[PDB]
Amino acid sequence: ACRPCSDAELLLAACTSDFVIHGTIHGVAHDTELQESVITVVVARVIRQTLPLFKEGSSEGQGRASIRTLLRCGVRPGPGSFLFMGWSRFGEAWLGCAPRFQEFSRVYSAALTTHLNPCEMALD
């Protein structure tokens, strides 16, 4: 449940997911009882969502929001911008895939160019 998504999986997930957001990891909190992690992301942009999970920006400037995953996946804060995608459970975001933004951009460009993209989205 922690393995990276293949490029084919990324493409399908980005169209079928409840949310797709671009951002960086500010911090990670761990729940050692539930064995889950809560990832706090700085949201650069909401690409698409099926539910009002996320928004971009705030009165403080940047907006932050959190995404759950399994503790064993070992997610860490770090530099790097990612495209987080996943599903909602009880109104909480859960992580499905998290490619680097430039990696998903490559995949989507290739899919668009081959007309293999299952949907359209604006990554910019």
Swiss-Prot record:
Keyword Secreted assigned: yes
Keyword annotations from UniProtKB, A to Z: Developmental protein, Differentiation, Disulfide bond, Neurogenesis, Secreted, Signal
Disulfide linkage: 2-73, 5-97, 15-119
Tissue and organ distribution: Highly expressed in brain. Expressed in undifferentiated neural progenitors and in astrocyte lineage, particularly in Bergmann glia, a subtype of radial glia, and a few discrete neuronal populations residing in the superior colliculus, the ocular motor nucleus, the raphe and pontine nuclei, and in various thalamic nuclei. Weakly expressed in heart, kidney, skeletal muscle, spleen, testis, gut and lung.
GO biological process: axonogenesis; positive regulation of axonogenesis; radial glial cell differentiation
One cellular component term from this protein's GO annotations in UniProt: extracellular space
Localization per record: Secreted
UniProt key word Heme: no
Induction: By all-trans retinoic acid (ATRA).
Similarity comment: Belongs to the meteorin family.
Additional free-text comment from the UniProt record: Was called meteorin because it can transform glial cells into cells with an elongated trail.
Function (record text): Involved in both glial cell differentiation and axonal network formation during neurogenesis. Promotes astrocyte differentiation and transforms cerebellar astrocytes into radial glia. Also induces axonal extension in small and intermediate neurons of sensory ganglia by activating nearby satellite glia.
Subunit note: Monomer.
Protein name per Swiss-Prot or TrEMBL: Meteorin
Annotated source species: Mus musculus (Mouse)
Gene, per the UniProt record: Metrn
